[PDB]
Structure formats: structure tokens, C-alpha cells
């Protein structure tokens, strides 16, 4: 059993993605976070559940939605959300 | 070039440019010193985020 | 695995509820504590088990009984009982 | 403000629901800002057995 | 690991309760089902998690909300939702 | 008889509390004795989405 | 614990989807089945893991890949793969 | 009415596509469920797969 | 046979210890060979509440 | 994770112990069961927690109380309470 | 996860109990320590596992053997073995 | 007073049961109030192997 | 949770052991340190995991490899690597 | 959390190893099983603890003793002891 | 040939013969149809094994 | 007395080796514990390692 933790950088991504979706539908930005949530939390008891990332080694890919991927790493003491990205386009970006 | 059934991209160079960007992004995110915050704090930062948006109406 | 800790303010809540109840039934005071306690401890191995609080963000709600709610926050090093409240009335008071 | 059906909410009217939810928010915020460090479960357990014991003594007198 | 199953009678409850709740708030009816759901399913891996029912022995009580209780029984081979009820009033009182 | 303090009980009267309990006992006993076989969670899930969809259409 | 079963129609979709990917890259059609596998089998012990389908009620969606979705139903006695589809386009074919 | 969606808000280009996609998916699943041919277990699909790729690799 | 110190064993003499351990072995072997299939925890829990309830009724009479 | 099951013979033991105790203290009968029960259930997530029985091989001993032992066997599909015995005297009898 | 620590007074018990047990069975003294060990250490990952002590509140009882009890307290930062005692007799009654 | 049935208690007398309890309460309270800092498990483990070794030598 | 610390003398053993393995195979002396690593660090969250040393009391033995043993002590405040030795021969050297 | 299971073939090895050691010291054969035990059971909560086997891929190596190795595989539903072998010699053998 | 510090074997061919044997052994053990028995049954088979040996004295 | 052990019952050839090995190990640990030089954390040993192999690889 591992506690679920997010990197400060994966949360900065969450705003950048939700804020962008709020411009058209504020509920779509909300619904996304609920599908994001429903992937991140299940990992506490089943961490080694999602396959390893091909593009980024040592990380695991969650295709939460056709256009969105959650990237996590299973540490010695926790499950760590590294970044959340758009599966098709280069978004969000570094600032 | 790539067929949409074959890949989520458009060309072979897209499977290069995107994946190098992602590699650089993760490497930036890992090298970052700011310690990782637990799920319930992200949860808190979220409710605050949507609440601030709903107020702009 | 996280250790279960209570905030001084949640205990000084437990006292309050148990004292009022005892005024009628001293065993109901007791029975409540078995159930309140038998809610708080299971969290040590399953911390993300109870849904997040709507009214208070960053906290989680345990409807331990129709009239009683336990509010906890999971953290970096422990599961923390923040307050125990009556689910329907404003009681016990803060001090 | 309007009235609520018990199926809809745990409160009698919205007025109550608002009053209650602001109280709870203020309570948690008081409880978190509090300096007294958090005591582990077994100490609360100790403070409990002591509490009921003191009451039971008061009933048989 | 146990599969989560509902009794026909427990769904018959869900129906009556959402059809009733909806006539005031169609989203409240929805939200309720999502809080019931988020209780019922977690039982598949943790069935002995909610305490036993006092009023009904051999059953377990989930106070999902101050006004709503889920009643389940952990069988030899499954977790079974027996009924969903209003925690304070006699409802839904099956009319047939 | 004796009505109860809201901290003590989720009911107003002892008389009531019991009337509720007996009802719940009779309800569970009816629901368990029921022959109609148990439906899995995903079918209830289906019956739900169907239910709300039918209501939203009555606009 | 539930046994993993596929509907004949979900396997005819695998045939129409992999017999098409092989024309451009025979390994890509292989790699897909391996991501389609390590998402169908894990369901035997965790069947209520993927969220319910919005578009199709009573079914559950697995976004296995940005372009591909697995649709399954958790029966009284099994986990059933109903169909495998293209998340973006209307494919595979009818017969 | 017909709108042009962002690939950041939907997996569809327009709303017309989403409707005709979601009716197709509904019809597909409903066809697949009404289908009488009994469901085959995972290991048989696994078998049918290894056989499928093997037959392709043989085609030079 | 010889006598045992309470620090050494939960029994008074070895004779008892042997008698007890053969009894336990025979008991388990009887219990396992038994055909009646195993009942889940919540049914035992049910059979319990019923048991104590029947006794409490017998005390207040 | 394994479901907790009791053998009919261990229950027809629980009855016996509770009936004898009640002859003196009916609450001691009750208190025992909370503790016996509060030993048996923790095994669902931690089955290899109590050491193996010396006197009876293939079984595990729970010294629930100085005078009482719970004997369980973990298996393929469930944690099984075999018998409940008095740790010091030959009681309750088999039937 | 909590580190397992023993109070000086709980070891002082272990001493008295093994030195006593040994004068009859040097292996029984050994075996006892291995059953105490196999209780004490598992607490590091599962501290709230043994029930609370009735006689001493805020402490937890491990009936390691019908004649022997381990008493521990789960602190803010550790699992602490308070004393090891004979479950039936007043022993080891610290002589100084 | 009143002696107890072995099924009911691990003691022979109520008088005794209590005398034991008060002793345990006083023992724990002495042991907790004790200033000497707590030694980690592996040091107790060390003190053990040392203890038996010293005894085996007295052959 | 305990921090992983090495005694200066345990690191001088690593130096004498790897500076000798490098003479035959420089990669073998590397591979050894990687098996010496993924056995020393895991102790931070599980320090009472390896059995106590028989030959040396108060210490714990890690048979990292058929020819190599890690000796550690779990202190009040840390996990301490005492020495790394050859499981078969008297090596490394004194100084 | 995974249940600990042994393959029939890893138990046939256990006899072949213990029986061979009983010819010289019957207690040494016993002590070995206790060190074997103390490696196999800890895996239920920490399965991915021992490194993967180099010689046999998909398996994990436990150097329980300089002369003995435990080989296990972490399945979908259990931790499986595959074989127990002498780390230096080809023993026990196939029959 | 190998130095004992370098390897648990004796020669390079020993690191071939032993590892092929182990590979063949595991592959035999996995292909085996007899279902895996739980820890407590092995535990039972053990107590029985040592008991049978102690009796031969 | 001096005996010839099987490599299946002990990690030593003879019993004389075991005694002189176990006294050496006892003396080694006792030297290592009595040592005043403060204990360095894992990441510093990790650093001292990468530096060690790097210096060796440089030697052609």
C-alpha cells in the first residue's frame, strides 16, 4: 500500500489544462479532473497496474482520455504523479 | 508520414519532436527541487481553482 | 502505511459529545466512541477510502452515524482527525 | 431562502444549510490554526477510558 | 476479492429515491447515486470495512449521507446490496 | 414513549425509533426472501443512466 | 475473482483492426495487442477499475491508447470484452 | 447546431461527428450484445492472435 | 511424568500437556473432516447477536 | 485479500463458550466475542500474521486472551476459523 | 511506518524471565524470546493491530502465550514495548 | 471476595484479579516514568544473544 | 522511517572489495555495488527485514550474493551499514 | 497484498535439500527451513523487494544463505516460490 | 577460469553449465501441471517431514 | 576437533576455518564500531563510488 502524491509540476499542468478548457466549457474542465482523479487515486493499492512509458523510461502511462495522459512513477515510499499532458499535441508548456 | 490508425501523431518527425519535448519536460519536472504535495492538497488546490472560475460569472 | 493521529481540538470534541449524551445515556456515549474509533483506525492502511468534503476542501468526510461526521486530512507523515461534528446541528462548539 | 425536502438535504431550509456550512468552515479553520500538537490514537483512547470511568463513578454514588 | 452485486429490491429503492429527489433537483438525484456508487464498489476489495447493522443482524450499514443508508451483506461468494433507505424516515416504503 | 435528544438519536421519539427499526427489519427480510436473482453493479449502473436519460427527455 | 471472456464480435474487431495495422507496420499491430492484453487481463481481479461508459450505459471504457478504446461489461459471472473500437473514427467494419 | 471543437476539449472535429459517432457506437454495442455466437475466453483470443500474426509473417 | 513451573508451561504437569495436545489434535481433525460447509463471518455475527439477545430476554423475566 | 470464513464447528464452539460464561457473567460472554471477532477479521488483509501452531500443524494460533486460542488455516480462496479453544483446559468439547 | 523500541524496564523483564525459565529449560527460554520477537517486530508496519489494554489504558496487550503478555504503546514516532509480564502471576516483580 | 470460574477468568479470585491489575498498573506507571531512554529492538536482540551465551558458558 | 547511513569502515571495505574485483572484471565490481545498493537502501522503510547475525549479536546479515554479506545495525535513529564482507574468506584487509 | 504460494516442484526441492542435510545434522536441516521461511513469508507485503534473476528472467532471487537461493515469481494474484537451489552446485535434481 | 571474488563458480563454462541447468529446471517446474500449494500446506508438509526424521532415533 | 564439512551443510571447508572466520568477523565488527570516524550517509558513499569507478576507467 503506497500513498498518492503529486509533483508540484504536475499540479501546475492541471491548472494550465483546466483554465484552457474553462474558456469554452467550465464543466468539461471539471469532468476532466474527475476522470484524472479516478485514475490517480486507484494507484494507491494497485500501483504497478498501468504499463511503463515508452517515450519516457521509468515512468508509467495512464491514457485517461483519448487526448490526455497521466504520467506517474512508483517510488520506494509513494506513487508520484510526474506530469499530465495532452496525448496528441505539445501542451502544457514550461513557462 | 503516418496513418492515424498506426499512430496518434501525423509524421515520423512528430514522433521525434513530441517525445523529445516530453522527455525534456519530465527531466525538468524531476530535477525540480519543490517537494511533492500529497493528493488531498492537490484536491484542495482544485476545489479552490474551480470556485474562483465559477465566481467569474 | 500511515499512523493515525488526532488533533487536540477533535478530542476536546469527543469529550463534549460524550458528556452531553451521558446526560441521557452513558452507554450511548460509549457505543458512539467504539464506532467513531472504529472508523478512524481503518484509515491507517486505507487513507483515501472516504470521499473528500464538499463544505471543507482538503478534508475527508466520514458519516460514522446519521447524526455524526468525522473530518480527517491525510498528509505527508500521518492520517489526521481534524474534528468530530454532529451531521445535522451546530454541535459541539469550538473553544 | 426556500424550504428543503428531507430526501434532498440533511437540513430543514437552505438558510440552515448555509449557517451550518459556514460554522463548519470556521470550526475546521480554528482547529487547524490551533498550536497544540496532534496526539496519537492510543492517547485519545486513554483519555476516553478515563472519561467514561469518571462518569460511571458519578452514577453509582 | 469479491464481486459487488445488488438485490433487485435495492435497485427498486434507487429508482424510487432518484425519481423522488429529482422532482426538486435532478442533479441531487445524480450526485446521490455517485455517493452511493463510491461506497458500494469499494467493498469488492474491503468488504468487512463498514460496521455491522444493529437493527438488522448479519447486515452492514453504510451511512453514505446523514439521510441515507446502504445495507449490505458479505456472502460466501459476493458483496450484496440488500436495500438503500432514508436513514431517518420510512422511505422508500415499497407500495407493492 | 420518551422522546429523545437529537445528540442521542437520529429519531424524535423512542416509539418512532422502533417503528423505524421494525420497518427496516421487515424490509430487509422481504428483500432477502425475494426470489428474483441479484443483478451485478454494472446492470444497476445501466438502469441508472437509462433512468435519468428518460427523465431529461421529459423536457 | 471473475474470469476474462471476449464476445465473438469483440475478437472480429481485433481481426479487422490488426489486419489493417499490419499493412503499414506489422509490429505496430503486434504492440497494440500487447497494450490491449495488459489492460483486458488485469480486469479478472480488478473489474470495477475502469469508469463506466458515458455514450453506452452499462459498459466500461478502457482508453488503451489515444486512438483505441476497449468496451467491457462486468456480468454476474464474468468480465466481458464487448467491442474494441477506434476512439476517433467509426472503425472497424459491419459485415 | 454545427460547431468547430478544439482538439483540447473533444476527440471529435465537429459536434455532428460526435452525434453520428455516438449513435454508431450505440448501434455497434447493441449488435454485439444481441449476437448469439457465444463469448470465447481470453486464452482462445490469445490463440487466434498468435495464429493471425503467424499467417501474416508467412506472406513474405 | 514430572511437574512444570508456570513460567515454563501453561499446564500443571506434562501429563496434562500431552492429554490436552492429543485432545486438540483430535478436535481439529474432527472439525476438518466435518461435512457442513464454512459460514462467512457476518453469518456467525448474526448467530451471535441472536444468541446474546435470547439470553438477555431470559435475565429480565 | 482473502475473505474471512468460519467452520460450522468453530461457531458451535463460540455458542458453547458464550453459554458457560453467561452462567456467571453474560457481558463477559459478550466482551469475549468482541475480542474473538476482533482477531479473526484483521486476518483478511494480513493472513500470515499469527505464527503456526506447534500442537496442530498447518494451522495458526491466535492467543486472543490468556484463557482462549483461535485456530485458523489460510487457503486458496479464504482465511478459515477452524476452532476456538480454552488455552488451558479441555473445553469446549467437540460434538 | 514506525520504528520498534523497547523500554529499559521491558528488557529488564526479558532478563528476569529468561534467567528464571532457563533453570528448567534453556531452550524454552530461547523459544519464548523467539515468540516475543515474532510479535514485537510485526508492529512496525501494523501497530494498531493488537487490542487496547483494559487494566492499563492507552497501552496495547499482546497475549504472546497463555502465560505471557507484551504491553506496548504506539507513540507519535515509535512502537514502544513498555513491559513483558506473566499473564497469570505477579512476575517479574522488580526487586529494586 | 467471590472466586471465579476458569472459563470466566485467568485468575482464581476476584480479590486476586485486582491485586494483579493494580500491580500491572503500578508496574507500567513505574516503567513509563523511568528516565533511562528506550533502547531499539536490535540492542535488546544483542542483550539476548549475550545473555544465553553467558549461561551456556556456565557448563 | 529511518535514514540509511554507512560507517566509514564499511565504505573502506567497499573500496578494498571493488578495487580488487576491477582487476579481473571492472563491470563485475560495478554489478556488485548495484546488488549492494538495492539491498542497503530498501532498509530505510523495512529495517527489521533481514534476520539477526548469529556470529555477531546485535547486527543483521544480508547475504547480498553467495560470496558477499552486508552487516547492518538498526539504531534508535538510523539504519547503519557496519561492514561489507566476503561470506567465505577473511577479506577485506585491516590497515 | 499478495498470498504466498509454493509450486509443488519447490517443495519437492525442500525435502531433497533437508533430507540430504539430516544425514550429518538434523538441526542444520531445520535451521535452513527457518531461514528459508523468513524470506518467503516477508514477500506477502513486499513482493517486489528481491532483485530479478539474471540467469532466469521473470523470476526473483533470494540469497537466503551463501550456499542457498530461493526463486520466486510475482503473479497477478500471488507470490510463487518456483524452486529452491544450492547457489554453488547443481543440486537438487529432476528425478 | 574465474577468481572466487569475481564469481561463485570456478570457470566460465561453470557459469554456462549451471545456468543452463537452472533455466531447464525452472522451465520444467513452470510447465508442470500440478497446481501451486499455499504456504501453510508447505508448512504442514514440513512439520511432518522433520517429525518423521526425529522418530528415526 | 578438526572435521571436513560438506559445501551443502556449511560455507566453510573445515570447522577450524569457521572458528577463525567467526573470531575475525567479531574482531572486525568490534573494530568498525569502536572506530571514531563518523558514519557517512548512503548518498555520500554513492558519490565516493561513482568517483572510484571513474578514476579506474581513466587508467586506459
UniProtKB/TrEMBL annotation, chains A, C, G, J, M, N:
InterPro entries for the chain: RelE/ParE_toxin, RelE/ParE_toxin_dom_sf, TA_system_RelE-like_toxin
Keyword set, alphabetical order: Toxin-antitoxin system
Classification via Pfam families: ParE_toxin
Coiled coil: none
Domain of life: Bacteria
PANTHER family per UniProt: PLASMID STABILIZATION SYSTEM PROTEIN, TOXIN PARE1-RELATED
Similarity remark: Belongs to the RelE toxin family.
Name of the molecule in the record: Type II toxin-antitoxin system RelE/ParE family toxin
Amino acid at each position: 500500500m503506497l500513498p498518492v502524491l503529486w509533483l508540484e509540476s504536475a499540479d501546475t499542468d492541471l491548472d494550465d489544462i483546466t483554465s484552457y478548457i474553462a474558456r469554452f466549457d467550465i464543466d468539461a474542465a471539471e469532468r476532466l479532473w474527475q476522470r484524472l482523479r479516478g485514475c490517480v487515486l486507484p494507484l494507491s493499492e494497485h500501483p504497478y497496474l498501468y504499463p511503463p512509458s515508452d517515450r519516457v523510461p521509468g515512468l508509467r502511462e495512464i491514457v485517461a482520455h483519448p487526448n490526455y495522459i497521466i504520467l506517474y512513477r512508483v517510488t520506494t515510499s509513494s506513487v508520484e504523479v510526474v506530469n499530465v499532458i495532452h496525448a496528441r499535441r505539445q501542451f502544457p508548456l514550461e513557462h | 508520414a503516418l496513418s492515424p490508425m498506426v499512430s496518434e501523431f501525423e509524421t515520423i518527425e512528430q514522433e521525434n519532436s513530441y517525445n523529445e519535448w516530453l522527455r525534456a519536460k519530465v527531466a525538468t519536472s524531476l530535477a525540480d527541487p519543490r517537494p511533492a504535495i500529497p493528493h488531498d492538497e492537490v484536491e484542495r488546490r482544485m476545489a479552490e481553482r474551480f470556485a474562483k472560475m465559477r465566481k467569474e460569472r
